[PDB]
């Protein structure tokens, strides 16, 4: 080092950039940290080595500070704090925009060992910069996609540290200026106040608003189970019901109408109320199709991996468009209308059971089931279909010299064996009778073993059970709804819903920061 | 009256236990189920009747029966070009079949899990 | 003991970015460990063995 120093060279050897795709522009300094050498690193710094860099890896560490954090060494971070003399301002961000905190969260893993140490260092760095900056916003710096590190937690599907960052204890010395998102008062056992800040559910896109839609997720079903959330949620629900059940009721009415309009519709009160029927249908139809439409718009045509949660949305849409289409071809007097109509009907009712989402708690199992069961059943249905088709052509071919002939027909005579109205009759008529019957018998056996396979399969699937995970699945299933009924109808029955949701004013003038605005929890 | 009798099983036998625990959860879940089953079958009922509205497959109740017998498996599924929208009619009740199936499956597993 | 090599190495990582020696596992030369386990191997349960990391990385690749 003293040699390169003595060289007086334009760029010392620390200015060297490691090659792309593995560690891109990674300093020997970064390498040093990677090697966990405190002394020589302190020297490199003392050699006048620099912070700001790009290391790429899968540990981004564009601020070497962050690299240190990733390595989980205090001494070195404090060494940055001190060494050489200056520190690396945490206020500095990388090319991804991701600040050290954001970085921590990125790398924040499930593994509760690693997760724990990360927590320790997280809060530690929090109080550190808070003791050193000391006053500036350490959190709240927008990432690439603008994100608080907490917001970043959500989108990245972070979990344990989300729990931590949410429920914190800092307090002394000034650490209560950070506030740790907590307070307590007027209780024998902890009657506590919570700071709903980025969670506020109206302002911009809340933590809730993130997790709800924007968030990709292996499993989001867990996160809404967090206390400072579900208290709020349930509250909002209690708050929100009557409008919900009303909307429900409206829908129901509409169905009634639709039904009558269909049933009492002749082969063409009185013609007056007939035209009324059709028109009313058309009105409902346009309404919904509008509603659901701008719903998608509001999703910006967001790629729906939410299908599992969102299928109802689609069903509405599809229903609606079929309805209005039906009436189109009514006025136009097209041949096929009532088939499309009644399809929209049948579907319509089938759509209804959506509003179970709210009422009952076994809806939970109905849904978890709905998820896995539909997946497995599809996989199944394809194969069933295919080989039955095989057998179809078999039978038809052997029959090709009364009439058991039509392929479709043959396939029916063969399908009715799975709902058990089937035949299996033997007749020497066919003259290869032997093999024909032998064959469909093979069919029977085969489709049986198939259904058995499926039955057990999905059975096993729920045998291994995360239990209240389902409960939570229901919980959020409800949450999405609440966040949607949060704002009005841009079908414009009521276009503008107020931002009237809000939080209690904060009681906290700790030190130089003089106030907040927040929420209340209880007991435990 | 007879159905009432089996009350006095309460005393005699010890598998009465499982018969009851079952009786509890099973009845709850079965009710929840039965409502939905009922409702959408009703939907399909009006569908079929409507398409049939131009021998007689007509009476709503009747139609609902012809459709119910698919769940105890005496049902029909016969195709006839008679109706002239035959295509869709049969297509529809086929949807029915599939649907009520996936439903019973759902229930079966559900309560199964409950006692798992 | 690194002449025996222990079938391992490591470099250029904050956490262990490692190199493996595929020797008798090489999947082409003669009959590989894979080629053995695949067919020749009698087994109560072979289903476990392919789950080993230095394998399934190779396999998936």
Automatic annotation (TrEMBL), chain B:
> Which stretch is the leader sequence?
none
The regions listed as transmembrane in this protein's record are 30-51, 83-104
Q: Can you say where in the cell this protein is located?
A: Cell membrane
- Superkingdom of origin organism: Eukaryota
Name this protein carries in UniProt: Transient receptor potential cation channel subfamily V member 2
Q: Which organism is it from?
A: Oryctolagus cuniculus (Rabbit)
Q: What's the encoding gene here?
A: TRPV2
Q: Which residues of the full protein are shown?
A: 561 to 702 of 817
């Amino acid at each position: 080092l003293e040699i390169d120093r003595d060289s007086g060279n334009p760029q010392p050897l620390v200015n060297a950039q490691c090659t792309d795709e593995y560690y891109r522009g990674h300093s020997a300094l970064h390498i040093a940290i990677e090697k966990r050498s405190l002394q020589c690193v302190k020297l490199l710094v003392e050699n006048g080595a620099n912070v700001h860099a790009k290391a790429c890896c899968f540990y981004f560490g564009e601020l070497p500070l962050s690299l240190a954090a990733c390595t989980k060494q205090w001494d070195v971070v404090n060494y940055l704090l001190e060494n050489p003399h200056p520190a690396a301002s945490l206020q500095a961000q990388d090319s991804l925009g991701n600040t050290v905190l954001h970085a921590l969260v990125m790398i924040a893993d499930n593994s509760p060992e690693n997760s724990a140490l990360v927590v320790r260092m997280y809060d530690g760095l929090l109080q550190a910069g808070a003791r050193l900056c000391p006053n500036v916003q350490l959190e709240g710096i927008p990432n690439l996609e603008g994100l608080t590190p907490l917001k970043l937690a959500a989108k990245e599907g972070k979990i344990e540290i989300f729990k931590h960052i949410l429920q914190r204890e800092f307090s002394a010395p000034c650490q209560s200026l950070s506030r740790k998102f907590t307070e307590w008062c007027y209780g024998p056992v902890r009657v506590s106040l919570y700071d709903l800040a980025s969670v506020d559910s109206w302002e911009e896109n809340s933590v809730l608003e993130i997790i709800a839609f924007h968030s990709r997720s292996p499993h989001r079903h867990r996160m809404v189970v967090l206390e400072p959330l579900n208290k709020l949620l349930q509250a909002k629900w209690d708050r929100l019901i009557p409008r919900f059940c009303f909307n429900f009721l409206c829908y129901l009415v509409y169905m009634l109408i639709f039904t009558a309009v269909a049933y009492h519709q002749p082969a063409l009160a009185g013609n007056s109320m007939l035209l009324l029927g059709h028109i009313l249908i058309l009105l409902g139809g346009v309404y919904l199709l509008l509603g659901q439409l701008w719903y998608f718009w509001r999703r910006r045509l967001f790629i729906w991996i939410s299908f599992m949660d969102s299928y109802f949305e689609i069903l509405f849409l599809l229903q609606a468009l079929l309805t209005v289409l039906s009436q189109v071809l009514c006025f136009l007097a097209i041949e096929w209308y009532l088939p499309l109509l009644v399809s929209s009907l049948v579907l319509g009712w089938l759509n209804l059971l959506y509003y179970t989402r709210g009422f009952q708690h076994t809806g939970i199992y109905s849904v978890m089931i709905q998820k896995v069961i539909l997946r497995d059943l599809l996989r199944f249905l394809l194969v069933y279909l295919v080989f039955l088709f095989g057998f179809a052509v078999a039978l038809v071919s052997l029959s090709r010299e009364p009439p058991y002939r039509s392929i479709l027909d043959a396939s029916l005579e063969l399908f009715k064996f799975t709902i058990g109205m089937g035949e299996l009759a033997f007749q020497e008529q066919l003259r290869f009778r032997g093999v024909v019957l032998l064959l469909l018998l093979a069919y029977v056996l085969l489709t049986y073993v198939l259904l058995l396979n499926m039955l057990i399969a999905l059975m096993s699937e729920t045998v291994n059970s995360v239990a209240t995970d389902s409960w939570s699945i229901w919980k959020l299933q409800k949450a999405i709804s609440v966040l949607e009924m949060e704002n009005g109808y841009w079908w414009c029955r009521r276009k503008k819903q107020r931002a009237g949701v809000m939080l209690t004013v904060g009681t906290r003038p700790d030190g130089s920061p003089d106030e907040r605005w927040c929420f209340r929890v209880g007991e435990m």
